[PDB]
Design a protein around this ligand. Structure first.
Ligand SMILES: CC(C)CCC[C@@H](C)[C@H]1CC[C@H]2[C@@H]3CC=C4C[C@@H](O)CC[C@]4(C)[C@H]3CC[C@]12C
Ligand SMILES: CC(C)CCC[C@@H](C)[C@H]1CC[C@H]2[C@@H]3CC=C4C[C@@H](O)CC[C@]4(C)[C@H]3CC[C@]12C
Ligand SMILES: CC(C)CCC[C@@H](C)[C@H]1CC[C@H]2[C@@H]3CC=C4C[C@@H](O)CC[C@]4(C)[C@H]3CC[C@]12C
Ligand SMILES: CCn1c(=O)c2c(nc(/C=C\c3ccc(O)c(O)c3)n2C)n(CC)c1=O
Ligand SMILES: CCCCCCCC/C=C\CCCCCCCC(=O)O
Ligand SMILES: CCCCCCCC/C=C\CCCCCCCC(=O)O
Ligand SMILES: CCCCCCCC/C=C\CCCCCCCC(=O)O
Ligand SMILES: CCCCCCCC/C=C\CCCCCCCC(=O)O
Ligand SMILES: CCCCCCCC/C=C\CCCCCCCC(=O)O
Ligand SMILES: CCCCCCCC/C=C\CCCCCCCC(=O)O
Ligand SMILES: CCCCCCCC/C=C\CCCCCCCC(=O)O
Ligand SMILES: CCCCCCCC/C=C\CCCCCCCC(=O)O
Ligand SMILES: CCCCCCCC/C=C\CCCCCCCC(=O)O
Ligand SMILES: CCCCCCCC/C=C\CCCCCCCC(=O)O
Ligand SMILES: CCCCCCCC/C=C\CCCCCCCC(=O)O
Ligand SMILES: CCCCCCCC/C=C\CCCCCCCC(=O)O
Ligand SMILES: CCCCCCCC/C=C\CCCCCCCC(=O)O
Ligand code: NA
Length: 383
């Protein structure tokens, strides 16, 4: 069949993807500018991520359509066209990595976060990443390419002038750079690092919840042994150690009557007044229900709020890896198996449009998983 027929379908799908990539991600940057609640260090990385997805539809996708024609051009002008999308992919990887680290510091060392992670330092970190992404993505232009061994039979058949070449990715971009340098070092290694950071995040949160529950059960279980008891001095000692262990306002009050009531009943045991030491220790049961019980339930909800946020960010990085791995696996076959038959053009088309689809999914996740984004999105849509 005519080659223009199948080309029109691929061009149509690519042009539609760019429209959704530009529209949705601009809506993300608009919400962060208006709503001040969205103006935190974690969201400055998702705006840098949205800018990379906006630039995919404005530049990378139009570049991909020009590559498909095999037009004649200077080999270095062809290099910038074929390799610019690598600059945007590296920027997203660093943005995903930075997001995972931010949520780790928030759950591991929550007290120092506001002093550790500041808005003026992230603006330089984002700038450092974008400059480094241009270096990684444009590495073939520094000499690691195939401009010195041009395909003349393809250049003569295409009618290319002197100094030009049939602009094709697999012709000017070496496949050892794509597999060893791009996929392994710059993509796979940071992705595995992202998997490790999220493991330590979910485990630490599961341990903090378990530590809080046991500190509550130690406060309750030992309340039954003082009332059914030197035996009262033992439990009142496990009282305090577990009371301050759970200390990690109205709460600061409630702990003061708690540690105070346990202190009063403690000395009543050192001098033998057992029945009075008992009676002085069932009055702290009222303080437990009116103050210490409320602090524990509030911290459990706050813990879930941070975990839900860590889950949402973990989904974004997972969707990235799913949309980009099929393309890299196909390159591993072209490189590691020369006796294999090269992947057909339709499968390559499917791998290109699948990698482009990652520039559309992220604004959907924020609206579905982050309430503040969804509400802010509605105010702009209504107005
Ligand atoms: C602000 C935005 C839109 C700027 C966009 C700049 C783009 C469109 C420009 C900048 C550099 C340009 C390339 C530079 C060199 C060559 C080699 C030549 O033989 C064919 C054109 C080609 C391949 C150019 C295509 C267009 C190009 C990629
Ligand atoms: C990345 C996750 C979702 C797994 C997806 C599976 C993909 C990447 C796998 C499954 C089957 C694979 C194909 C199986 C056989 C061949 C024939 C060979 O001559 C070229 C590679 C090619 C065409 C493979 C390319 C990669 C492939 C399409
Ligand atoms: C951390 C995980 C996701 C890494 C993914 C593993 C990658 C690197 C693995 C999985 C499947 C592998 C391919 C499976 C089959 C073949 C055919 C063989 O004739 C050459 C090697 C080749 C082409 C392998 C190359 C490496 C490969 C692509
Ligand atoms: C993300 C990196 N990357 C690649 O890894 C790649 C590639 N193009 C090929 C393969 C050739 C090919 C693909 C589509 C076509 O229309 C065509 O005419 C030829 N590869 C292996 N693109 C260009 C779209 C690309 O940017
Ligand atoms: C934008 C997505 C739809 C594009 C419509 C124009 C099609 C042009 C063509 O396929 O030749
Ligand atoms: C052409 C380049 C397009 C890229 C645009 C990049 C991002 C613009 C983001 C504007 C608002 C985000 C920063 C505001 C803020 O939170 O302080
Ligand atoms: C937003 C989309 C518009 C921005 C620019 C889009 C792509 C321009 C590509 C121009 C390449 C022309 C190739 C023809 C030639 O080499 O002579
Ligand atoms: C929403 C994104 C809109 C993008 C609009 C631009 C899309 C088309 C871009 C340039 C097409 C490539 C130009 C190459 C000239 C023809 C090549 C040839 O005939 O040999
Ligand atoms: C913003 C800058 C606007 C750029 C507009 C599109 C340029 C696309 C060039 C493709 C046309 C190639 C010339 C030709 O067909 O002979
Ligand atoms: C914006 C980036 C400009 C990249 C263009 C550099 C390639 C020049 C073509 C050449 O000198 O052969
Ligand atoms: C081409 C080589 C130079 C690359 C320049 C990289 C552009 C970085 C732009 C600004 C970075 C974001 C700063 C906002 C915080
Ligand atoms: C490795 C890839 C992780 C893929 C799992 C991410 C889940 C996506 C939506 C559920
Ligand atoms: C090698 C694939 C890496 C996938 C990264 C997924 C990000 C974390 C996902 C849930 C745990
Ligand atoms: C985690 C992934 C572990 C490594 C996976 C495979 C690396 C690629 C293996 C190289 C294939 C060599 C076979 C050949 O060249 O003939
Ligand atoms: C939704 C289905 C779209 C079409 C299939 C998408 C991906 C299929 C996965 C791999 C199947 C193997 C494809 C290889 C084609 C034949 C290879 C050959 O001709 O030697
Ligand atoms: C992932 C989402 C996939 C969307 C469904 C597939 C859309 C079109 C991909 C382009 C298919 C290429 C058609 C032309 C192939 C050819 O005959 O040369
Ligand atoms: C055509 C492009 C369709 C994009 C598919 C993903 C859309 C949003 C998922 C929720
Ligand atoms: Na992206």
């Amino acid at each position: 069949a005519p080659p223009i027929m199948g080309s029109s379908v691929y061009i149509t799908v690519e042009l539609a993807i760019a429209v959704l990539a530009i529209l949705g991600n601009v809506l993300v940057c608009w919400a962060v500018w208006l709503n001040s609640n969205l103006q935190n260090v974690t969201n400055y990385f998702v705006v840098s991520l949205a800018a990379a997805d906006i630039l995919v539809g404005v530049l990378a996708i139009p570049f991909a359509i020009t590559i498909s024609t095999g037009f004649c051009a200077a080999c270095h002008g062809c290099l910038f066209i074929a390799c610019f999308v690598l600059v945007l992919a590296q920027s997203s990887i660093f943005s995903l990595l930075a997001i995972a680290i931010d949520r780790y510091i928030a759950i591991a060392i929550p007290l120092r976060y506001n002093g550790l992670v500041t808005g003026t330092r992230a603006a330089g970190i984002i700038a450092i990443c974008w400059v480094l992404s241009f270096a990684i993505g444009l590495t073939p232009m520094l000499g690691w390419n195939n401009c010195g061994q041009p395909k003349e039979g393809k250049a003569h058949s295409q009618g290319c002038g002197e100094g030009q070449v049939a602009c094709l990715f697999e012709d000017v971009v070496p496949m050892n750079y794509m597999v060893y340098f791009n996929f392994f070092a710059c993509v796979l290694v940071p992705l595995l690092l992202m998997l490790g950071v999220y493991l330590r995040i979910f485990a630490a949160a599961r341990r903090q919840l378990a530590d809080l529950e046991d500190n509550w059960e130690t406060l309750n279980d030992n309340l039954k042994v003082i009332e059914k008891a030197a035996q009262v001095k033992d439990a009142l000692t496990k009282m305090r150690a577990a009371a301050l262990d759970a200390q990690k306002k109205d709460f600061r009050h409630g702990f003061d009557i708690l540690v105070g009531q346990i202190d009063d009943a403690l000395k009543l045991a050192n001098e033998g007044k057992v029945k009075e030491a008992q009676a002085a220790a069932e009055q702290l049961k009222t303080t437990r229900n009116a103050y210490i019980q409320k602090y524990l339930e509030r911290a459990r909800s706050t813990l879930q709020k941070e975990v839900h946020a860590a889950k949402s960010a973990a989904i974004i990085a997972g969707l990235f890896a799913l949309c980009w791995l099929p393309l890299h696996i196909i390159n591993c076959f072209t490189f590691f198996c020369p006796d294999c038959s090269h992947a057909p053009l339709w499968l390559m088309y499917l791998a290109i449009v699948l990698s482009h689809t990652n520039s559309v999914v992220n604004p959907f996740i924020y609206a579905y998983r982050i309430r503040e984004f969804r509400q802010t999105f509605r105010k702009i849509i209504r107005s």
